[PDB]
Amino acid sequence: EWLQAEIARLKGKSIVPLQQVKTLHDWLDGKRKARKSCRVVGESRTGKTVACDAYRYRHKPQQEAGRPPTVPVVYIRPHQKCGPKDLFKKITEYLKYRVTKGTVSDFRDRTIEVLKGCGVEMLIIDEADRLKPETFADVRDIAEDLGIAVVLVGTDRLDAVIKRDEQVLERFRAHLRFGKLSGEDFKNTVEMWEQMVLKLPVSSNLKSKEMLRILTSATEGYIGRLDEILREAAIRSLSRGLKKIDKAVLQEVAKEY
Amino acid sequence: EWLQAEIARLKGKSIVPLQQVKTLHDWLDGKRKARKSCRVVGESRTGKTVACDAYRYRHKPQQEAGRPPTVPVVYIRPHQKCGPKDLFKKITEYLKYRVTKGTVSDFRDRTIEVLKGCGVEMLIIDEADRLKPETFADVRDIAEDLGIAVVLVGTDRLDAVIKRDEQVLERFRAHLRFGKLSGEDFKNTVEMWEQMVLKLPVSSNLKSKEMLRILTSATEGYIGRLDEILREAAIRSLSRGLKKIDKAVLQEVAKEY
Amino acid sequence: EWLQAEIARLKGKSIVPLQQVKTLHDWLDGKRKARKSCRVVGESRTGKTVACDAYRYRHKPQQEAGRPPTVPVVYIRPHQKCGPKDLFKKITEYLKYRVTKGTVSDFRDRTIEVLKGCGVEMLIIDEADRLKPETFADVRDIAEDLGIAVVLVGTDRLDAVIKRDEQVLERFRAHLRFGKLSGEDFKNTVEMWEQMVLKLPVSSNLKSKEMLRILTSATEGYIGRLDEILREAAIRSLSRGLKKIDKAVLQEVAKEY
Amino acid sequence: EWLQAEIARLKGKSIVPLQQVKTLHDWLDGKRKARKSCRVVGESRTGKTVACDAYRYRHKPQQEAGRPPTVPVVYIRPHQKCGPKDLFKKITEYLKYRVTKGTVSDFRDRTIEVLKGCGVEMLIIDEADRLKPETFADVRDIAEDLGIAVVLVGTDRLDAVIKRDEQVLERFRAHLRFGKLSGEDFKNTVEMWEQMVLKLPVSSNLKSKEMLRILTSATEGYIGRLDEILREAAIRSLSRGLKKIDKAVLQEVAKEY
Amino acid sequence: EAASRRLRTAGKTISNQSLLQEVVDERQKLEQTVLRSAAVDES
Amino acid sequence: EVWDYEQLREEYG
Amino acid sequence: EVWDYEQLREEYG
Ligand SMILES: Nc1ncnc2c1ncn2[C@@H]1O[C@H](COP(=O)(O)OP(=O)(O)OP(=O)(O)O)[C@@H](O)[C@H]1O
Ligand SMILES: Nc1ncnc2c1ncn2[C@@H]1O[C@H](COP(=O)(O)OP(=O)(O)OP(=O)(O)O)[C@@H](O)[C@H]1O
Ligand SMILES: Nc1ncnc2c1ncn2[C@@H]1O[C@H](COP(=O)(O)OP(=O)(O)OP(=O)(O)O)[C@@H](O)[C@H]1O
Ligand SMILES: Nc1ncnc2c1ncn2[C@@H]1O[C@H](COP(=O)(O)OP(=O)(O)OP(=O)(O)O)[C@@H](O)[C@H]1O
Ligand SMILES: [Mg+2]
Ligand SMILES: [Mg+2]
Ligand SMILES: [Mg+2]
Ligand SMILES: [Mg+2]
């Protein structure tokens, strides 16, 4: 049946090439050329993690015959309270090596060995605020012992962690902020989410200026609210046998907050 | 009967001429020509052992009318905790000589004797991490005193064992990495298994995106998982009177991983 | 191609003989002559590390045939939470010795043995605040038993660490403070960078008082900010087809901090 | 065929008169004349074995009409975990006596007799770390009872073994440190290898800046790495029909380390 | 004037160079930056 | 254009 | 005079 397959995509996640993502990708290209360590900051659900993943994918590992892969961009997200051993494990496993049993000293030396030769040139640490205060020293040592641009990604929660160590603060001072959208950029984004993401059976014409108040009141300009609303409404509409997102559905979803 | 004949075939093993096999063979040919010692490292079930077997079969012993055979490539897998006498016994029996009862010194001198005259150019030691640490000295002496390219094969556990002895580490510094399959290479490998390995009466259409999705999730790029899933799925399918693998049987197998 | 080579030049680091570096080098010569242990303290990116690194390259090892090298100055940066075996391993490896697995007592005796005979007379420990509280007792015994001027380098976090141990504080009271720089020598330092570091084909005229203003505001007197802004401004300007750094690019960089 | 002759040449080994070889030989001439027991210590693949082997050829056996040969230098490498009998076997076989099977005591008495009879004055024991603890007592008795300089050759593992028995430690206090190549000495070594070892039809100019940077990074100053890299790179270049080592072939080899 | 207090109490070497840093390295800050709004930028 | 995390897992992976 | 960080290693070596 048709409806269950639409639900199976609408409960999924997708990537939309917003201009915010483009702007980050030009910036990360400049940092990767300069090997410039830096940070990406901005409120929750602003699209940072999805923009970072899109950068990983477009700069995927290149295979070379019988060599370790060339992996220009390594993306990791630490587990909470990430120590040095946890950091080294995530980096080495990302490069498709297996960690052996060993000391932190073994893990460090093995990680530095494979950060070389795999030709890593950027390290993106998402949820960089999950790093333990002692493991930033190893992150800093990677940044300056190798020609690697380390990009710390977090919310303003990260800046509190950063400013608690002036050696971290002074290495990651350069920054880019993901902001909330508004106005015509929000209108174009809302238009994109109808006509590119949902691709629903019958249009709702989400350029409409009045219902844009309903979105704004729930969405506050968070993309990660906007993308949530429409999938909730569309699944309900297609569950209810409505070929469009009706106002009665959008406002009911937007009322759950 | 048809069924038991097909089951007896699928139960077995075979060698598929994957590109990573050819890559290793050309590299081993270079190392053998130069008599350079080296190591082969890669994740478990990535195909290292089959590729090393395929090499020594392409370079099997040559008879010369009542001389001992010219045997340019020796392949051994040591048993666990292989001591020096075990190692010498492995090598001697490969060259078609019987080990007479004697001391380790007698075994060493006899092995050194028959590595000459058989004209051994390359010695491949698979599961080289099973060697006792004292046994590496005798492996180094074979590389040093005879002009023999010794190739250590193992997983990342070998790379840790080797780094516990600078004299071994510094001799086997050159390496080849065996990788997992992914992407287009994995899609071609699935196509080859359907055509060249399983050889069912009817096309299983394993190139299909829905089939690749199942296979990619369960195989994770390990050629060992790919082989042992598809053979078992074919055996299950034939046992049910199906003339091909189907999604339901394939999912039923893949669910066990 | 022109650009990729110059970009790779700007992407690497350089050293410039600033008066702070010259001042430290004379001070370290006095301390090394006197065998006086001391600390070098100052805010991040004031140039302490580059200055201490330049000091060891100016006092390079002397080799004489068949002896271990005469190495007057040893420079180490400990890993985070450096214990005594980590410290001993750092010193012995700098002196071109391989450590053999053994007890702390064995690592200690081997380090004391080679700190003699290599003729070490100054030990610079960069980011000494990484040292565990227990390993400071071995640092003090190196300073007291041998005739070695130990130099602790760090931020004010080092002063926090050593004030918690009376016996460490009193041995390392003699100190030199690295400063941020502003005005005349800052103006000279900006000019020195465009003369000796950027080497762009056309003059950027960063000597211009309005260019010095924006650099004053962003670099805030840290040489590690000044270097990173100009290098990043060069790569952007060259990549945008500009022969020159000018405010339209320089202030785009400067606003990024 | 010319190519097969050139590969056969580059495949092998040759002795190059490096300055560290002359240093060792002059030092061994002193110790042999003073009849003084000593040790040669240096990290792996620094060239200790080739240098000691060159010394026994410089001081080959000498003959008198109707007399046994005087053999001033005996060179042995023990097998791993060498007991007394295997030491005595090694020595007596080098002096060209097939000692009939017998007791350790019979082997000892015969070894003393031939060490006296052949006029041996220096006994170089390469990889002396391979001796069992019980065997150093027999090595000490050869040094003490006969007028023989015993030279223990090994890595820093030998220094650790020797420290475990005061009676060996105090007999072998004198040492020569065999060191790695660096600086201009490395550059002179690279040029000697091109002119004297590789001897290719066209000059490769390996001493030039980019080539020297590749070799410096890949060899790290080990003469073992320098020899093995350039020989394989020469074999690869000639196999491709090149008349020289090309930069691409050199980096291709260097990338495997 | 305020910088000279934090300058000397930290034992810093007294100079215009160091004093200027203690200027640049809050109720009165909000108040003074309100008073910064001035007709010389507006007339 | 839009992408699926599951496609990107195969395609780039 | 310029003092390139690589030339300091070349001089130090
Ligand atoms: N560019 C985008 N295309 C498609 N969906 C998006 C995009 N950006 C955000 N999303 C949706 O909104 C959610 C929030 O995005 P993302 O996880 O990247 O934000 P974030 O700022 O990294 O969040 P946090 O700081 O909370 O971890 C995503 O899970 C996804 O559902
Ligand atoms: N070239 C090949 N052709 C066909 N099947 C293969 C090939 N290589 C591997 N296989 C399949 O994968 C299995 C595992 O491969 P193999 O034994 O070579 O692994 P390995 O890398 O040596 O593993 P381990 O390190 O765990 O011992 C084989 O037994 C076979 O089923
Ligand atoms: N004398 C100098 N010549 C050239 N560049 C310099 C000099 N001093 C500093 N730099 C630049 O500033 C950066 C920071 O300098 P440095 O690493 O010496 O700082 P630091 O004081 O040791 O910092 P931290 O305390 O944060 O570890 C250098 O990596 C280099 O880019
Ligand atoms: N004088 C030399 N001339 C030419 N090649 C040399 C020379 N010395 C060393 N080599 C090269 O370096 C290799 C390693 O040298 P060597 O066997 O002497 O090492 P070693 O110091 O005894 O090492 P280990 O301690 O690991 O046994 C040689 O096999 C040869 O390829
Ligand atoms: Mg996130
Ligand atoms: Mg195997
Ligand atoms: Mg520093
Ligand atoms: Mg040796």
One-character DSSP codes across chain B: -HHHHHHHHHHS------HHHHHHHHHHHHHHHHT--EEEEE-TTSSHHHHHHHHHHHT--B--TTSPPB--EEEE-PPTTB-HHHHHHHHHHHTT----S--HHHHHHHHHHHHTTTT--EEEETTGGGB-TTHHHHHHHHHHHS--EEEEEE-HHHHHHHHT-HHHHHHS--EEEE----HHHHHHHHHHIIIIII--SS---TTSHHHHHHHHHHHTT-HHHHHHHHHHHHHHHHHTT-SS--HHHHHHHHTT-
Side chain identity at B132, as an amino acid letter? Answer: K
Strand partners, C41: C154, C177
Distance (Å, whole) CA A89 – CA A68: 17
Burial of D130 (0-12, 13-18, 19+ CB in 10 A): buried
In Å, the largest CA–CA distance within chain C is 62
- Residues A124, A55 contacting (CB under 8 angstroms): yes
Q: How far is CA C43 from CA C56, C89, C213, D123, E13, in A?
A: 21, 28, 22, 60, 16
One-character DSSP codes across chain C: -HHHHHHHHHHS--B---HHHHHHHHHHHHHHHHT--EEEE--TTSSHHHHHHHHHHHT--B--TTSPPB-SEEEE-PPTTB-HHHHHHHHHHHTT----S--HHHHHHHHHHHHTTTT--EEEEETGGGB-TTHHHHHHHHHHHSS-EEEEEE-HHHHHHHHTSHHHHHHT--EEE-----THHHHHHHHHHIIIII--SS---TTSHHHHHHHHHHHTT-HHHHHHHHHHHHHHHHHTT-SS--HHHHHHHHTT-
Whether residue C220 lies within 8 A of chain E, CB to CB, comes out as yes
Distance (Å, whole) CA D158 – CA D41: 8
Contacts of A100 in chain B (CB under 8 A): 156-157, 159-160
Nearest one of D223, C123, C69, D22 to G13, comparing CA atoms: C69
Residue D159: count other Cβ atoms within 10 Å of its Cβ: 21
Position in ligand 4 atom list of the atom nearest CA B167: 26
Nearest one of D46, D115, D103 to D76, comparing CA atoms: D115
Nearest one of B129, B119, B126 to B158, comparing CA atoms: B129
Distance (Å, whole) CA D195 – CA B33: 23
Nearest one of D125, D145, D128 to D35, comparing CA atoms: D145
Alpha-carbon torsion angle B152, B153, B157, B163, nearest 10: 20
Residue A133: count other Cβ atoms within 10 Å of its Cβ: 11
Distance (Å, whole) CA B174 – CA B161: 15
Tell me the two tokens of residue A57: 């994918």
Strand partners, D40: D153, D176
Give every CB contact of residue D16 below 8 A, 6+ residues apart in sequence: D192, D193, D196, D197
Q: How far is CA G2 from CA A22, B206, C193, C196, in A?
A: 39, 64, 11, 6
Binding-site residues of B for ADP sit at 13, 16, 45-50, 227-228
Question: Closest-lying ligand to the alpha carbon of A140?
Answer: 3
Give every CB contact of residue D100 below 8 A, 6+ residues apart in sequence: none
Distance (Å, whole) CA A45 – CA F2: 19
CB contact under 8 A, B43 and A96: yes
- Residues C66, D27 contacting (CB under 8 angstroms): yes
Strand partners, A15: F3
Contacts of A62 in chain B (CB under 8 A): none
Query: Which helix (H) or strand (E) element contains residue D39?
Result: strand D38-41
Tell me the two tokens of residue A185: 């950029």
Give every CB contact of residue D151 below 8 A, 6+ residues apart in sequence: D28, D31, D37, D38, D39, D40, D52, D122, D123, D124, D125
Distance (Å, whole) CA B130 – CA B119: 26
In Å, the largest CA–CA distance within chain G is 20
Tell me the two tokens of residue B19: 């590109």
3 state SS of D152:
strand
Give every CB contact of residue A21 below 8 A, 6+ residues apart in sequence: A47, A50, A51, A54
Residue nearest to ligand 4 atom 5, measured at CA = D15
Residue nearest to ligand 1 atom 28, measured at CA = A224
Contacts of B175 in chain D (CB under 8 A): 256
Between CA D95 and CA D102, with CA D96 as vertex, the angle to 5 degrees is: 95
Distance (Å, whole) CA A141 – CA C82: 14
Residue nearest to ligand 3 atom 26, measured at CA = C44
Resolution (A): 2.3
Distance (Å, whole) CA A233 – CA A247: 10
- Residues D231, D12 contacting (CB under 8 angstroms): no
3 state SS of A151:
strand
3 state SS of A139:
helix
Tell me the two tokens of residue C124: 């610079």
Q: What values do phi and psi take at B52, rounded to 5?
A: -70, -40
Nearest one of A144, A193, A195 to A172, comparing CA atoms: A144
Tell me the two tokens of residue C185: 């020598």
- Residues A180, A67 contacting (CB under 8 angstroms): no
Tell me the two tokens of residue C138: 């071995």
Chains F and D touch (3+ CB pairs under 8 A): no
Query: Which helix (H) or strand (E) element contains residue G9?
Result: helix G5-12
Cα A126 to chain centroid distance, Å, stands at 7
Nearest one of B39, B53, B47 to B224, comparing CA atoms: B47
Nearest one of A180, A196, A202, A219 to A14, comparing CA atoms: A196
Distance (Å, whole) CA B84 – CA B76: 13
Give every CB contact of residue A5 below 8 A, 6+ residues apart in sequence: none
From the CA of A47, how far away is ligand 5's center (Å)?
8
- List pocket residues of ligand 4, CB cut-off 6 Å: B 167, 170; D 13-16, 18, 21, 44-50, 155, 223-224, 227
Contacts of A102 in chain B (CB under 8 A): 160
Cα B98 to chain centroid distance, Å, stands at 25
Give every CB contact of residue C234 below 8 A, 6+ residues apart in sequence: C10, C198, C200, C245
Give chain E's radius of gyration (CA, Å): 15
Method: cryo-EM
User: In what order do the strands lie in the sheet containing A38-42?
Assistant: A73-76, A122-125, A149-153, A38-42, A175-178
Side chain identity at A118, as an amino acid letter? Answer: C
Distance (Å, whole) CA A230 – CA A214: 12
Query: Which helix (H) or strand (E) element contains residue D207?
Result: none
Q: How far is CA C100 from CA A97, B164, C221, D43, D161, in A?
A: 27, 10, 46, 11, 10
Nearest chain B CA: its distance from A64 CA (Å): 10
Between CA E4 and CA E11, with CA E6 as vertex, the angle to 5 degrees is: 95
Distance (Å, whole) CA E19 – CA E22: 5
Q: How far is CA D38 from CA D134, D172, D177, in A?
A: 19, 5, 11
